């Protein structure tokens, strides 16, 4: 209306706005050690590849890039930037040494000697592939013969399988009888590494990271950052999975050593312990109320 | 060596990790019913109540497993002077597994693969009460060490069972056994079971449970629960 009589009218409401945000989370202590899968100085042979399981720790992938320029850094199922934002149940690391020009066969759907006789990958592999040159450390002028690889096999390999059986690969009709010679060849053949070899024949070190999910708790997740702690101001907060808006003040509650939160008669949170530093903090809502306009008649 | 005796008002644990002060709360969870059978000296069912009062600490360790053999995963706990070891290895146990004090050949014949480990302070350190429950891929335990005057039965009193540790294992438990360390000796312990019930807990101003009411024991308790 365009005319107002004498009286008091309730018009609107108001609420104090938040100023900033606060995020708190426990200390990062159980670092997943990746400086052991990297730096082995001994990567064994491709036909006998080590498998290592990483579990029950915080995994930071920033330390991966701290090494030399990687010849091949390919990620298939996960965005490299989002490695710290998505987490899985367990992670498997596989390491070995192959030739320079055989790197292209370590990938899903590839076909080749190293692909189907020593290390076979599944079609839906999820993870990244690491490959960098190591000529200066795995080469001698005399010649290196400690890095073998399979050459003959009766059949192919199922994905994620190993075979160490060393028997005479029979090719002729007559029995080999466990001796070598005509149509009876040893299946394992050794590489040769010298400092003068051209690129494509120098030794290369390969590390493969695999992620998977199954019906179990994750128990392995990336490092989660946190902010500082502010008090006596209308602020937002996320105290280890609990979200709310209010003012943090000092509290005088005797929490037992195993509670994390506090409640009242009406089932509302009113006390939280700081995860980083054990201390009881009391929360109160930010002020609000109605607004009334007092006016005589517009006449 | 079966025997039977009353249970009285024992076996109440904190349902969660929430702090409350001077507030009566109602909970619907698994508890030991008041005034019930407890066997005196093993299917797991849905929970176990465990107690013992011998100082010699001959009882040490509980073997949780579905088959009690090397076929299926088994949870092994050992409490000794230094630490505690928790494994998910499928050991091959014996008919009467007991410690030698310290070869484990009598406890189990052989060990094999497993994918989880743990080490911490030993649980043991008078009547000691324990509760073992497993759910949603998590094996939670509770305990309480209480000094008890010279008595031949469970005292008339209340003692809450605080949580100790939770493990994300996710394996079923159907049977469990006892372990002793040995010369002839004697042991005394009790076994109880957990049942889905509804209680009414009372909190003091310091956040400790001091009293409880069973909502199905008798009509008066039902009236108390209804009136809160
Ligand atoms: C020890 O290793 C065996 C494999 O040699 C594990 O068996 C696997 O268990 C998982 C989890 O139940 C299954 O998903 C796989 O299909 C199993 N594979 C095989 C080949 O058995 C076993 O779980 C490991 N741990 C124990 C305690 O035995
Ligand atoms: C990792 O590489 C550095 C680079 O020289 C080396 O000093 C360190 O000893 C290595 N760690 C190992 C081999 O464990
Ligand atoms: C987390 O780190 C800070 C900084 O050193 C330390 O003061 C605090 O005690 C740590 N948290 C715990 C629970 O120890
Ligand atoms: C406790 O003892 C046995 C346990 O099976 C049972 O038959 C009995 O009814 C129970 N109650 C009493 C009072 O003995
Ligand atoms: C207790 O058991 C652990 C299990 O490895 C062992 O390391 C420790 O030495 C044992 N304590 C003593 C006193 O032998
Ligand atoms: C335990 O066995 C039951 C059937 O006997 C099955 O339903 C359940 O999933 C199993 N739990 C495990 C393997 O954790
Ligand atoms: C709660 O703790 C305070 C401070 O320690 C104490 O004075 C009070 O008696 C306690 N209340 C109890 C034990 O009921």
Curated annotation (Swiss-Prot), chain B:
UniProt-annotated glycosylation sites, renumbered to this chain: 37, 80, 113, 172, 206
Mutagenesis or variant effect for residue 148 to V: In strain: Omicron/BA.2.75
Record note on what altering residue 172 to Q does: Increased resistance to neutralizing antibodies
Outcome reported for the amino acid change (mutating residue 102 to K): In strain: Kappa/B.1.617.1
Effect of residue 28 to H: In strain: Omicron/EG.5.1
Putative superantigen: annotated segments: 204-225
Organism superkingdom: Viruses
Positions of the BetaCoV S1-NTD domain: 1-227
Disulfide bridges in this chain: 89-114, 215-225
Reported function: Attaches the virion to the cell membrane by interacting with host receptor, initiating the infection. The major receptor is host ACE2. When S2/S2' has been cleaved, binding to the receptor triggers direct fusion at the cell membrane. When S2/S2' has not been cleaved, binding to the receptor results in internalization of the virus by endocytosis using host TFRC and GRM2 and leading to fusion of the virion membrane with the host endosomal membrane. Alternatively, may use NRP1/NRP2 and integrin as entry receptors.
Record note on quaternary structure: Binds to host ACE2. RBD also interacts with the N-linked glycan on 'Asn-90' of ACE2. Cleavage of S generates a polybasic C-terminal sequence on S1 that binds to host Neuropilin-1 (NRP1) and Neuropilin-2 (NRP2) receptors. Interacts with host integrin alpha-5/beta-1 (ITGA5:ITGB1) and with ACE2 in complex with integrin alpha-5/beta-1 (ITGA5:ITGB1). May interact via cytoplasmic c-terminus with M protein. May interact (via N-terminus) with host bilirubin and biliverdin, thereby preventing antibody binding to the SARS-CoV-2 spike NTD via an allosteric mechanism.
Record's protein name: Spike protein S1
Organism for this UniProt entry: Severe acute respiratory syndrome coronavirus 2
């Amino acid at each position: 209306s365009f005319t107002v009589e004498k009286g008091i009218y309730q018009t609107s409401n108001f609420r104090v706005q938040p100023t900033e945000s606060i995020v708190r989370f426990p200390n990062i202590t159980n670092l997943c050690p990746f400086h052991e899968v990297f730096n082995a100085t001994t990567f064994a042979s491709v036909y006998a590849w080590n498998r290592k399981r990483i579990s029950n720790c915080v995994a930071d992938y920033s330390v991966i890039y701290n090494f030399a320029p990687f010849f091949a850094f390919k990620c298939y199922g996960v965005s490299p930037t989002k490695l710290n934002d998505l987490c899985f149940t367990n992670v498997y690391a596989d390491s070995f040494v192959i030739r320079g020009n055989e790197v292209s066969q370590i990938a899903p759907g590839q076909t080749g000697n190293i692909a189907d006789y020593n290390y076979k990958l599944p079609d839906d592999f999820t993870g990244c592939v690491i490959a960098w040159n190591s000529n200066k450390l795995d080469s001698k002028p005399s010649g290196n013969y400690n890095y073998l690889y399979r050459l003959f096999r009766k059949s192919k390999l199922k994905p994620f399988e190993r075979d160490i059986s060393t028997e005479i690969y029979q090719a002729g009709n007559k029995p080999c009888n466990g001796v070598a010679g005509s149509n009876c060849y040893s299946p394992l053949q050794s590489y040769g590494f010298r400092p003068t070899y051209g690129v494509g024949h120098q030794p290369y070190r390969v590390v493969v990271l695999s992620f998977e999910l199954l019906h179990a708790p994750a128990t392995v997740c990336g490092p989660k950052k946190s902010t500082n702690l502010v008090k006596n101001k209308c602020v937002n907060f996320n105290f280890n999975g609990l979200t709310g808006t209010g003012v943090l003040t000092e509290s005088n509650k005797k929490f037992l050593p195993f509670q994390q939160f506090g409640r009242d008669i009406a089932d509302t949170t009113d006390a939280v312990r700081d995860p980083q530093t054990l201390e009881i903090l009391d929360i109160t809502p930010c002020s609000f109320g109605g607004v009334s306009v007092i006016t005589p008649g517009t006449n | 060596t079966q025997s039977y005796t009353n249970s009285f008002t024992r076996g109440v644990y904190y349902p969660d990790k929430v702090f409350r002060s001077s507030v009566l709360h109602s909970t619907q969870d698994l508890f030991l019913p008041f005034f019930s059978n407890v066997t005196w000296f093993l299917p797991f069912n849905d929970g176990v109540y465990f107690a013992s009062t011998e100082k010699s600490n001959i009882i040490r360790g509980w073997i949780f497993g579905t088959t009690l053999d090397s076929k299926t995963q088994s949870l092994l706990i050992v409490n000794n002077a230094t630490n505690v070891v928790i494994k998910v290895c499928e050991f091959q146990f014996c008919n009467d597994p007991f410690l030698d004090v310290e070869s484990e050949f009598r406890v189990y014949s052989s060990a094999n693969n497993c994918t989880f480990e743990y080490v911490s302070q030993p649980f043991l350190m008078n009547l000691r009460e324990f509760v073992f429950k497993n759910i949603d891929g998590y094996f939670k335990i509770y305990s309480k060490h209480t000094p008890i005057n010279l008595e031949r039965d469970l005292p008339q009193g209340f003692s809450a069972l605080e949580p100790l540790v939770d493990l994300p294992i996710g394996i079923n438990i159907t049977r469990f056994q006892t372990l002793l360390a040995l010369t002839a000796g004697a042991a005394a312990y009790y076994v109880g079971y957990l049942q889905p019930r509804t209680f009414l807990l009372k909190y003091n101003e310091n956040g400790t449970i001091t009293d409880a009411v069973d909502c199905a024991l008798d009509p008066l308790s039902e009236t108390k629960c209804t009136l809160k």
